[PDB]
Amino acid sequence: VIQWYPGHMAKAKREVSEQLKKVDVVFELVDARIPYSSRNPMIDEVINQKPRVVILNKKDMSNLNEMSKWEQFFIDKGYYPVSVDAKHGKNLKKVEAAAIKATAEKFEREKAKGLKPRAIRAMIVGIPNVGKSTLINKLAKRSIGNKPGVTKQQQWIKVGNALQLLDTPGILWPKFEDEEVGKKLSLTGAIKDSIVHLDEVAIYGLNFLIQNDLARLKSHYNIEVPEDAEIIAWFDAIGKKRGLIRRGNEIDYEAVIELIIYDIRNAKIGNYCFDIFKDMTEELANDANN
């Protein structure tokens, strides 16, 4: 868990920019469930045109077709997007491959100038909980000061044939300013922190599922709900079917909310991408010119 406050943010920006000076390529790690909303709002100013591999992690918990629309988006920005499952170790060899492609022009011009070939230096950057330390551990094939009061120095990890990876990720803050992004981040568990009401997060999640995977929602909770019912009827049908009740047969809404949030966060109902590309056209247009 990370506590953001202005000074911590300024320190994070400073330190990540500094680390970025030591590398050839940056791996921006995002959640495949929200490839756009799980980005740091200042990521392009921090990265500052450094060759970029965008890694869509937790692909196992998302929708591939939707992810492909985001990959196309990143491609159009001049980045090299790849999707992985860092936890279950699926598709990792493509990280090095992507790095080689992203830095190919730099190293071609070095070879033209008569410089010796050399290992690619990379670092991973992203918001909390997108899977940075998981990915680093997996790429090192080992868990990455162990005496109290002894300070860890940053080190390079040999990865594959061509890649040196900084063993310490740059950690940046999530988008804060927008309430729908707040809900998306809470639904993926990127922020398990207050000042976004859980009941509203649960409502958002349920509505997402009603619109995009209604049969699955119903079969998962084994419920059937009138299509003209308001969202409260969904909380009630779930609560009643699961016996989440209190004070006779009133619905324990806190418990229903927690169950819905848990099931969406842990992909118990399905594998969804909550950044719907075609619904985010205006947001993308606003963010773009910068």
Nearer of residues 172 and 203 to ligand GDP, judged by Cβ: 172
130 annotated binding-site participant: yes
Nearer of residues 107 and 271 to ligand GDP, judged by Cβ: 271
Query: What is the widest separation between alpha-carbon atoms in the chain?
Result: 81
77 annotated binding-site participant: no
138 annotated binding-site participant: no
Nearer of residues 142 and 247 to ligand GDP, judged by Cβ: 142
Nearer of residues 58 and 175 to ligand GDP, judged by Cβ: 58
CB of 89 to ligand GDP, least distance (A): 9
131 annotated binding-site participant: yes
CB of 134 to ligand GDP, least distance (A): 3
- Residue numbers of the site for ligand GDP (CB under 6 A)? 57-58, 60-61, 85-87, 128-134
86 annotated binding-site participant: yes
31 annotated binding-site participant: no
Nearer of residues 61 and 259 to ligand GDP, judged by Cβ: 61
CB of 218 to ligand GDP, least distance (A): 24
175 annotated binding-site participant: no
C-beta nearest to ligand GDP: residue? 131
CB of 105 to ligand GDP, least distance (A): 29
CB of 130 to ligand GDP, least distance (A): 5
Per residue, what are the HEC states of the chain?
CCCCCHHHHHHHHHHHHHHHHCCCEEEEEEECCECCCCCCCCHHHHHCCCCEEEEEECHHHCCHHHHHHHHHHHHHCCCEEEECECCCCECCHHHHHHHHHHCHHHHHHHHHCCCCCCCEEEEEEECCCCCHHHHHHHHHCCCCCCCCCCCCCCCEEEECCCEEEECCCEECCCCCCCHHHHHHHHHCCCCCCCCCCHHHHHHHHHHHHHHHHHHHHHHHHCCCCCCCCCCHHHHHHHHHHHCCEECCCEECHHHHHHHHHHHHHCCCCCCCCCCCHHHCHHHHHHHHCC
CB of 181 to ligand GDP, least distance (A): 18
**Numbered residues of the known binding site for GDP:** 57-58, 60, 86-87, 129-134
**Numbered residues of the known binding site:** 57-60, 86-87, 129-134, 170
**Numbered residues of the known binding site for GTP:** 57-60, 129-134, 170
